[PDB]
Amino acid sequence: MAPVQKQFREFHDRIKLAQYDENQTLRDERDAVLTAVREGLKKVFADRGEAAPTFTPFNQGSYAMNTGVKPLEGGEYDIDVGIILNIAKDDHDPVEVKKWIRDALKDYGNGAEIRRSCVTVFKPGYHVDLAVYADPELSGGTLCIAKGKENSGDEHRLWQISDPQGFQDRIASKLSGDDAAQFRRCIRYLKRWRDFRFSSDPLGIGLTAAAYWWFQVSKRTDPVSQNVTYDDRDALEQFVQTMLDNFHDTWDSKDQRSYPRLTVELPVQPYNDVFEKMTGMQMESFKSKLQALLNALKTAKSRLELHDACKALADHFGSEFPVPEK
Ligand SMILES: Nc1ncnc2c1ncn2[C@@H]1O[C@H](COP(=O)(O)OP(=O)(O)OP(=O)(O)O)[C@@H](O)[C@H]1O
Numbered sequence: 672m673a674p675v676q677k678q679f680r681e682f683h684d685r686i687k688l689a690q691y692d693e694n695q696t697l698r699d700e701r702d703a704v705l706t707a708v709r710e711g712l713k714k715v716f717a718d719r720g721e722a723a724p725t726f727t728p729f730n731q732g733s734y735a736m737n738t739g740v741k742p743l744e745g746g747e748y749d750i751d752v753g754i755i756l757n758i759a760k761d762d763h764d765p766v767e768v769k770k771w772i773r774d775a776l777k778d779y780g781n782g783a784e785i786r787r788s789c790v791t792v793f794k795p796g797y798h799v800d801l802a803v804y805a806d807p808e809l810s811g812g813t814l815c816i817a818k819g820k821e822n823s824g825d826e827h828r829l830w831q832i833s834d835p836q837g838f839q840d841r842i843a844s845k846l847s848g849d850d851a852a853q854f855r856r857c858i859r860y861l862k863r864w865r866d867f868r869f870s871s872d873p874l875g876i877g878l879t880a881a882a883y884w885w886f887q888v889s890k891r892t893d894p895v896s897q898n899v900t901y902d903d904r905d906a907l908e909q910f911v912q913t914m915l916d917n918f919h920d921t922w923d924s925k926d927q928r929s930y931p932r933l934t935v936e937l938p939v940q941p942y943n944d945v946f947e948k949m950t951g952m953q954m955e956s957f958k959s960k961l962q963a964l965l966n967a968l969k970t971a972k973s974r975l976e977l978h979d980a981c982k983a984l985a986d987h988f989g990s991e992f993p994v995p996e997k
């Protein structure tokens with residue numbers, strides 16, 4: 672009946688990255704970029720002959736929500752930060768606003784770059800994704816993120832209504848206590864699976880939103896003593912089965928075939944499918960790999976030898992998954 676709970680908890684200990692509130696180093700790297708933006712902006716706007724825009728920053732992403740993992744060797748940390756500029760959205764092209772930040776981050780690190788949803792700045796061993804918002808007061812009450820690239824057409828340049836506070840609050844409030852800890856462990860486990868079996872360029876946000884909809888705690892409460900034990904292997908099995916169950920074969924007219932697609936809405940504005948950017952072929956590979964992980968989660972629960980159980984898990988979770996010698 673070989674259990675694997677101790678092995679999962681040790682795996683968790685190895686992969687987890689402390690969130691911003693417990694990570695001096697992350698805060699320091701964060702604050703450095705925010706400082707370089709403030710400093711940078713003074714020059715960019717001295718040129719324009721205009722007073723510098725101010726901004727309010729906030730923590731975003733997994734280091735804000737305590738779902739962060741350590742990258743594998745060669746991999747990069749992803750420091751996500753929002754900045755709310757004291758500007759009215761209706762008065763500015765969003766890409767143009769993003770240009771102020773890239774130019775402010777001209778010299779800092781290996782430079783800065785304007786992505787579709789953020790300005791990203793590169794440094795040795797990490798990047799910082801700055802999501803750029805217009806001021807809700809000056810912009811008629813909504814918080815809108817700057818969407819669009821430099822090369823992007825007109826209909827793809829926009830201020831999209833967002834709700835990062837709402838999203839973070841739903842992730843943190845879904846469960847509590849040791850139930851919530853298991854939720855977070857299972858997101859992390861799957862982000863290492865991602866880093867191990869997917870190429871370095873199943874989104875993090877995808878699995879997070881997915882767990883919000885479909886994660887269920889797996890624990891046993893002894894009827895007599897009320898003593899609780901968690902079963903992380905079982906929690907992943909049910910969660911992964913539930914995701915697989917929600918793939919829909921979706922016809923693509925252009926390719927004249929169907930691909931299995933997992934759709935997962937953000938539980939807050941704008942309720943976009945967080946996986947919409949994955950192509951049909953990437954979704955098909957995502958599904959096969961999910962099925963193979965499910966198969967190993969089941970194999971792991973029916974091995975006499977702890978070695979054989981752990982090995983089956985290590986083939987999917989990678990070489991930081993502990994495999995005790997036979
Ligand atoms: N496709 C999307 N739709 C809506 N919001 C998103 C999307 N992608 C990212 N975000 C927002 O930006 C944040 C940072 O995105 P990122 O891709 O870094 O995910 P993350 O949660 O930090 O996970 P990871 O640990 O993989 O970095 C998310 O946590 C989410 O609030």
Ligand SMILES: Nc1ncnc2c1ncn2[C@@H]1O[C@H](COP(=O)(O)OP(=O)(O)OP(=O)(O)O)[C@@H](O)[C@H]1O
Nearest residue numbers: 732749751785786787788789800802816820833948
């Ligand atoms: N809705 C969102 N809210 C906040 N951040 C987001 C959102 N969507 C994406 N991001 C951020 O930007 C990063 C990548 O998303 P983006 O859509 O900008 O990629 P892209 O510019 O299309 O690049 P690629 O060429 O790789 O497709 C994520 O890691 C995340 O931090």
Ligand SMILES: [Mg+2]
Nearest residue numbers: 732733749751
């Ligand atoms: Mg992130």
Ligand SMILES: [Mg+2]
Nearest residue numbers: 732749751800
């Ligand atoms: Mg990011």
